Design a protein around this ligand. Structure first.
Ligand code: CAC
Ligand code: MG
Ligand code: NA
Length: 327
DNA sequence: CGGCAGCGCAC
DNA sequence: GTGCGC
DNA sequence: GCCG
């Protein structure tokens, strides 16, 4: 689906990014939705009225869209803080968001070297810093595959019936991936237990895992590892690797959630809500019970979903292949 | 206007 | 509790 | 930022 409003979506992507790095995440969200629409519009935008007919574009966005169309420029871009470029540089560090970026900028830091030399860093940020270049580049789809295989082989050594699948952008079919998320479960419903720990162990012993960002995260019955790996071989880069072990009963929803994209998940939650349901990485459930004051005082009932299709079906939706989940 | 999900971790 | 990424 |  070619974009017929490039010079517009280009200038808008700059302003969006600017708001994002300065902390205005919600406004950044709005821009990103509007920018998507502009790209997937069935043709070029020629009027303010036309612009306003596209869901996701309101008066203010139309206003900007038309300014670029007619004038070829966007004044707003000229008044963007000079700090932006640096705030982005600092936030490209895994573990450092806008607040940390702003703090470092206020302390007079300007380069990655200043950070490395005078900045106070958290354990995660330090790891993020030494792997700045590596974590910045998207890896070839092929390397993501090898990483998944490495995890799978080591997991199946403990139990051959385990099911492993790489999610994220990789499962959505992208040529390159910024990271790998390996979701692991077992069809029998309980043999996935007591796998997480010895698996990370096995992978560390063989030198595959080089750094831990979060060694273990317990979310209900889901165990998640956020770390860094590097395949054997000279010239291999370090890569962001996540490992998630979940009970089979939550495999579908976990698969759906970690395959994303983040915009897709967002739309699915919104839709669940309209049907009186909630969708999480754990399950599709009826909405929670709330008292007169309108406050969660009783979880909803989980609606069993063996496969992703079951989730789409219960939401009265046509199944969407992973490759079609960018938005 | 409030919602745009809500979680667990490191600090 | 806040900041961050999932 | 947009939406209801
Ligand atoms: C101000 As309005 C069109 O978002 O209700
Ligand atoms: Mg507001
Ligand atoms: Na960051």
């Amino acid at each position: 689906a070619t974009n017929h409003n490039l010079h517009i979506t280009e200038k808008l992507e700059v302003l969006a990014k600017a708001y994002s790095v300065q902390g205005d995440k919600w406004r950044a969200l709005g821009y990103a939705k509007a920018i998507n629409a502009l790209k997937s519009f069935h043709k070029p935008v020629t009027s303010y009225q036309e612009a306003c007919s596209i869901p996701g574009i309101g008066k203010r966005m139309a206003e900007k869209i038309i300014e670029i169309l007619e004038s070829g420029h966007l004044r707003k871009l000229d008044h963007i803080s000079e700090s932006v470029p640096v705030l982005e540089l600092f936030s490209n560090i895994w573990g450092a968001g806008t607040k940390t970026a702003q703090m470092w900028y206020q302390q007079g830091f300007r380069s990655l070297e200043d950070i490395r030399s005078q900045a106070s860093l958290t354990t995660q940020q330090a790891i993020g810093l030494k792997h700045y270049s590596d974590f910045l580049e998207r890896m070839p789809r092929e390397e993501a595959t090898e990483i998944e295989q490495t995890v799978q082989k080591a997991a199946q050594a403990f139990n051959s019936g385990l099911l492993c699948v790489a999610c994220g952008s990789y499962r959505r079919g992208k040529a390159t991936c910024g990271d790998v998320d390996v979701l692991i479960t077992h069809p029998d419903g309980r043999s996935h237990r007591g796998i997480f720990s010895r698996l990370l162990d096995s992978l560390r012993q063989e030198g595959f895992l080089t750094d831990d960002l979060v060694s273990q995260e317990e979310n209900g019955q889901q165990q998640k590892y956020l770390g860094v790996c590097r395949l054997p071989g000279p010239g291999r880069r370090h890569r962001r690797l996540d490992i998630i072990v979940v009970p089979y009963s939550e495999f579908a929803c976990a698969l759906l959630y970690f395959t994303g994209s983040a915009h897709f998940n967002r739309s699915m939650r919104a839709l669940a809500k309209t049907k009186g349901m909630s969708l999480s990485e754990h399950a599709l459930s009826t909405a929670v019970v709330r008292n007169t004051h309108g406050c969660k005082v009783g979880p909803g009932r989980v609606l069993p979903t063996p496969t992703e299709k079951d989730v789409f079906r219960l939401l009265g939706l046509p199944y969407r292949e992973p490759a079609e989940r960018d938005w």
